[model samples]
Target: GLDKYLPGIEKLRRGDGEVEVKSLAGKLVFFYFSASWCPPCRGFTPQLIEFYDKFHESKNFEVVFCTWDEEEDGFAGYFAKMPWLAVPFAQSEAVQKLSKHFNVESIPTLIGVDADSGDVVTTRARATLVKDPEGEQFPWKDA
Candidate 1:
């Protein structure tokens, strides 16, 4: 179900170093591309955090951070403040590849995908979620 429309990723790890994915099997996964050094990323991180904390469970959502921090400390420090999974900074290749795969040209990009159908849900997820703070428009249909 997952790989039918979207590329498969082997794993996404928590800050404590555990592999995570069970709950994400048939949910919408948000691939977040951002960096600690980015000003815009810093500005948007709090709002993103609020959104993630609110519906991470209720909305059946999974956010995987594709970090662009150039150093381990930056990556670790940034993620330490986040409540989502991340592609480890040690896996630089994977991090960069994920960004490249999405053709990401900017920080703070949220790419939402439907894992059940392997469909691209929305590249405007951050904006959409921010706009719909009430979760009235969750599990956003692909557009």
Candidate 2:
């Protein structure tokens, strides 16, 4: 369980402040790593927004942005523009821990994890979303 991995992250941030925690037990989770200053992340945000809008309502999907922005203010400004959930910029520990666990070495990497066991589902989720903007073939590989 992510409980053992990402402990005590009960709620994620929206626009203003903390929001209620959404359970991840049976849904696919997207662990998104990006910084507001990254050019690629800027380019990718709109595409990701479209994909999120298409599938977020299904309630079978979730996107948890784990920012790599150097400043919390940058994270705040960038995240406010997003419609998906974000690990609080104040929760720097959680962001770094999750990034290390995923071995993130680049910005704009979207790692897909299975809900039940927290196992990685895909490393190329960015490519998957770009190719299937509607997320019609989401989970892109065998889950």
Candidate 3:
């Protein structure tokens, strides 16, 4: 359930040092490994954003924005434009380690994790980890 304090760039809920991974219990963690500058990422984020807006209330998913090893002042500003949480370019690199923990060597990947049991639900369209889409329907939360 990621209760082990999996290393990640903490989410700044109030910008007052109260960073934490929002409750992912019984939720799907969409380990979205991407970068703001990536072409595909630029393309995908909007669609995902739409999906989130439509379905966030039902899926209980965590769009964990795992980033490439990038750093920029624009990163945070750009991040503020999105509705998901990220582990930052710095911390998300650990995904390289985490993905490799499951054997991954690709970019623009998505790892669906069952935060409740710390199990993988799916890796469809993402090839950096062992995939196990628990038959969770697509458009699970789409408007």
Candidate 4:
């Protein structure tokens, strides 16, 4: 159910190597845009990790990193300590383009995408959906 326009993520591999977002179809996908910097980001990530730990399996959810610009080693060191997958830094430009398409301009942005329909469950996802679950029509239903 993925759209032809949807692109696969690299999983920090070869530039052209694509990890199909659609491969995660029928699953909930979280597109997290942030770096290892930012105090607020750091403060909140553990909670994010906890959330991932608690519900990822039940929701069929996965997280993909859309890293921010930083010194080569800085970016590398950031994720080297993390447990999730990310878009390779060599493909940074493409990630920027995708960010622009989504109208993102923040250090920490989370987008919940419905993999099957190739649609966004919510663009500003973490704020409301993750922080407050009482609002969504189906809670975790879209993805």
Candidate 5:
């Protein structure tokens, strides 16, 4: 579960409010590694957001923004445009831990994981989404 990896962390930001990390249990979770300063990250965000809006509620899908922004102000500004949850800017340590756990080496990377089994489903979710923008193959598997 995410709570195991993100120890001492309790909540994830949702707009001006927040939700417990525990709320993500048993869902298909996507760790979105991005930063506002990256042009590609900016460009891909809207596409991801559209995907999220389409499936989040009914499909038991959840996206957790793991920001690489250098400053809290930048994180906040970027997060405001997102409707999904995020690791709070204050928990940079948690963000770093997640980044390492997933071996993330680039911006605009989206990794899908099955929370029930802690199995990494796909590391190239960006391309997966691009090919199946409607999420016809959601929780895109590694192939």
Candidate 6:
């Protein structure tokens, strides 16, 4: 299901390079909806970073940032702090489509999806992360 949208998913590089989307074949993907200007987003970002750092090495998970920042500079400044992948700032249309697909109406929303099934596993993933910071119950489908 996500295959239709994967072509538009580009990873952000430190030097502002765009990398082709990596295969999420057997991974749990998190669509991180956030903006730099939102205080709540700023607060949650660090926590998500911590969680990401813990699991990224497994290659079983990935977080793709869909920025809601009003300006590209704001996105660049804020995204520098994150060690995960992101949709390019110039791909605002792609980001908008993703937001609508996920029905994201608020900032700091983390929607976890099963890449293989392309099914949304959790809509309240931010809360899931808070409850299991170490990702002891990662992907949390049975939680």
- Global lDDT of each model? 0.76, 0.79, 0.60, 0.64, 0.85, 0.78
RMSD of each: 2.4, 2.0, 5.9, 4.3, 1.3, 2.4
Per-residue lDDT tens digits for candidate 6, residues 46-70, read 9998888877767378888888987
- Residues 1-143 of candidate 4: C-alpha lDDT, one tens digit per residue: 33422355423421334464445668766777887766667865666676766667776777777788566677767766556657778768767877887888886777777667767776666565555543334234433
Q: Candidate 1 at residue 21, lDDT?
A: 53
Q: Whose TM-score is greatest here?
A: 5
Rank candidates by lDDT, best first. 5, 2, 6, 1, 4, 3
The candidate that wins on lDDT is 5
Per-residue accuracy of model 5 over 54-114 as CA lDDT, tens digit each:
8888879899899999788777788998999898888988889888988888889999887
**Which consecutive 10 residues in model 1 have the weakest lDDT in total?**
1-10
Give TM per candidate: 0.85, 0.88, 0.71, 0.76, 0.93, 0.85
With candidate 6 superimposed using the best TM-score fit, by how many Å does residue 108's alpha carbon deviate from the native? 0.5
Candidate 4 TM-score versus the reference: 0.76
Model 5 residue runs over 4 Å out of place are none
TM-score of 3: 0.71
lDDT of 6 at 92: 80
- Candidate 1 Cα misplacement greater than 4 A, ranges: 1-9
Residue 127, candidate 2: alpha-carbon lDDT: 77
